[PDB]
Curated annotation (Swiss-Prot):
Lineage summary: Eukaryota, Metazoa, Chordata, Craniata, Vertebrata
Location within or outside the cell: Cytoplasm; Cytoplasmic vesicle, Autophagosome; Nucleus; Cytoplasm, P-body
Organism: Mus musculus
Protein name as annotated: E3 ubiquitin-protein ligase TRIM21
Full-sequence portion shown in this chain: 291 to 467 of 470
Function: E3 ubiquitin-protein ligase whose activity is dependent on E2 enzymes, UBE2D1, UBE2D2, UBE2E1 and UBE2E2. Forms a ubiquitin ligase complex in cooperation with the E2 UBE2D2 that is used not only for the ubiquitination of USP4 and IKBKB but also for its self-ubiquitination. Component of cullin-RING-based SCF (SKP1-CUL1-F-box protein) E3 ubiquitin-protein ligase complexes such as SCF(SKP2)-like complexes. A TRIM21-containing SCF(SKP2)-like complex is shown to mediate ubiquitination of CDKN1B ('Thr-187' phosphorylated-form), thereby promoting its degradation by the proteasome.
Signal peptide: none
């Protein structure tokens, strides 16, 4: 029988896209910033300038929902992006460039609108839910630590083809950002 229900997709990390200093777990569900270049070959899909990686999953219709653990991290970016986004060089995270993201940077949460939007979060998230509804043109972020309170919704999105989960683990020169981003094992 038809029943309104939630469904959480299993996201795994695409090692070929990962910046070469990222350490990805054997099950491809966690990623952290390493202190050495890893034994991985460069290639065209790999993010060169930032500690970024894509989910392997790719979709161009329907609904997708996944959660990410961000505990003990002082910096990260999360969301969804076009399959076709730039991998090499410096770039801003904006819908203009094919990214629908939020981030934490120096104790401030922001949405990656153009220009950036301050997010007034009362309870720092430990887990974040990311929902995409392709046909609706919606990317929504939820604060699992605050009973799933809505953090931000991008609406009227221009997806313009296949999408990928997007992650930035942030740098760890400070020593306060070693913890991984984690997807459900």
């Amino acid at each position: 029988m038809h029943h309104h229900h939630h469904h959480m997709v299993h996201i795994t990390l695409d090692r070929n896209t990962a910046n070469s200093w990222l350490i990805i777990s054997k099950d491809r569900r966690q990623v952290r910033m390493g202190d050495t270049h890893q034994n991985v070959s460069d290639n065209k899909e790999r993010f060169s300038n930032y500690p970024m990686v894509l989910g392997a999953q790719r979709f161009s219709s329907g609904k997708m929902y996944w959660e990410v653990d961000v505990t003990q991290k002082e910096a990260w970016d999360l969301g969804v992006c076009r399959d076709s986004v730039q991998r090499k060089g410096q770039f801003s995270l904006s819908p203009e460039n094919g990214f629908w993201t939020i981030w934490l940077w120096q104790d401030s949460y922001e949405a990656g609108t153009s220009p950036q939007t301050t997010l007034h979060i009362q309870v720092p998230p430990c887990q974040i839910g990311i929902f995409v509804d392709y046909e609706a043109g919606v990317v929504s972020f939820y604060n699992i630590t605050d009973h799933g309170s809505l953090i931000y919704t991008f609406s009227e999105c221009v997806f313009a083809g296949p999408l990928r989960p997007f992650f930035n683990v942030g740098f760890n020169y400070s020593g306060g950002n070693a913890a991984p981003l984690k997807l459900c094992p």
